[PDB]
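Report of the visiting student (M.T.), summer placement. My assignment was to run the structure pipeline on a short list of targets and document each run. The first record concerns Glycylpeptide N-tetradecanoyltransferase.
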Amino acid sequence: MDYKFWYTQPVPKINDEFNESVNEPFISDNKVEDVRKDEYKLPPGYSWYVCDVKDEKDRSEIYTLLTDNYVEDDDNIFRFNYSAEFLLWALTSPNYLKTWHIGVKYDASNKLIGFISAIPTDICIHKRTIKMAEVNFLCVHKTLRSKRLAPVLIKEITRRINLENIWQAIYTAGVYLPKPVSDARYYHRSINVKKLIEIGFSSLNSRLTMSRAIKLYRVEDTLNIKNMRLMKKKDVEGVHKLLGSYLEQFNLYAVFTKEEIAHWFLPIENVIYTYVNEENGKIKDMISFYSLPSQILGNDKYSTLNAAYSFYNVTTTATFKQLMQDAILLAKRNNFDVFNALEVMQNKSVFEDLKFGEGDGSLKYYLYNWKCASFAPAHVGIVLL
Ligand SMILES: CCCCCCCCCCCCCC(=O)CSCCNC(=O)CCNC(=O)[C@H](O)C(C)(C)COP(=O)(O)OP(=O)(O)OC[C@H]1O[C@@H](n2cnc3c(N)ncnc32)[C@H](O)[C@@H]1OP(=O)(O)O
Ligand SMILES: CN(C)Cc1n[nH]c2ccc(-c3ccc(F)cc3OCCn3ccnc3)cc12
Ligand SMILES: [Cl-]
Ligand SMILES: [Mg+2]
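After the run finished, the structure tokens were exported:
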């Protein structure tokens, strides 16, 4: 890899290594007044488009572009299929900017062929809290790959973020770029074993017959934490306290306001699931996971893999293993086929006992214009959608 684009950016070179005493921008003393006011140039016949994610039709356009052209697994069997309602939630968090939801249309067809987005968040990296943009949903149509459109989308969003006097960003990708601050493998816990085998995701052998595989992943339909229930509006303060305190141990986490807790955690069917255990009107334990189905490509029987992805989980009245067991059960009660988690926070400690299998790859965490020491994923305390 030459990384001809990335090496022009304020990010580490492949060989850069910083000790814990270093925790600062690559480029400081930036000036809003100096930021370019002109949009980056696109190739002839393409135009910028400002997407209105609150408009059902504009939102449907983004949904279509992602459904057809977003992230596939390494074998091109599954493609992420974020729902339209999920994209509304993900992009309209507190203080979002409509001008950070950027499309590219092909003028002659009037169709969206590219997208990139950011939302603002306070990010604590090695105990320093910085206002950052969280970048997500970069996508170029399959038919226009390897034409250098992605650097155009990246430079244009950078410019729009810089106009708001924001100079750092956080992003994640499965691909290796200069240069990860942390790298987390993903693990999967089978729920609907038979389906996962039939679609090729899971395997049998002469020892592990179909019936034996089903038995292995069987779970008791009783919670360890009996009062675990869907989160309600009244629980916002308590979730804010519980989670906000928990996250301070990590090397990388978002500093959530109360308004951010209500947005990111209050339940929305088929989008975000949060459960809480209330004692004495105080929230003592919480479970959360989001819904990210994948379209199954080329399977006669099934079109969709329903997948729950571990989000934020905190226990003070049980063991972490007991809490994540309940999280798997609650995913099962909600019709999910598989429960997915990264080896961030305390997650790795429960993978063997709760019968997770190692996946085929990892998610890399990145910062833009920030130099600092890298760290094991157990010290990562943030999950991006
Ligand atoms: C202060 C504010 C700062 C704000 C900005 C922060 C940074 C935000 C950064 C964005 C974070 C988004 C996070 C996110 O959304 C979650 S990661 C998911 C990204 N989306 C997909 O994987 C969807 C399917 N793939 C595509 O749509 C295309 O393959 C994409 C658009 C990925 C690249 O289109 P393409 O047609 O395949 O490629 P060219 O146009 O020819 O471009 C080639 C250049 O793109 C570099 N590249 C490829 N994949 C990347 C990736 N995932 N991040 C960053 N850079 C990526 C690549 O290394 C090369 O640069 P190089 O020559 O130096 O190696
Ligand atoms: C994070 N958010 C930015 C979306 C995103 N983009 N890129 C990714 C690469 C992996 C995961 C992921 C995260 C947790 C997990 F349990 C399974 C995952 O992927 C399986 C499918 N796969 C394989 C290779 N590429 C995709 C998410 C993402
Ligand atoms: Cl340029
Ligand atoms: Mg391109």
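The pocket of NZE (ligand 2) is lined by residues 71, 73-74, 136, 172-174, 186, 309, 340, 342, 361, 363, 384-385 (CB under 6 Å). The domain at 183-366+374-379 is CATH 3.40.630.170 (Aminopeptidase). I thank the supervising group for their guidance throughout the placement.
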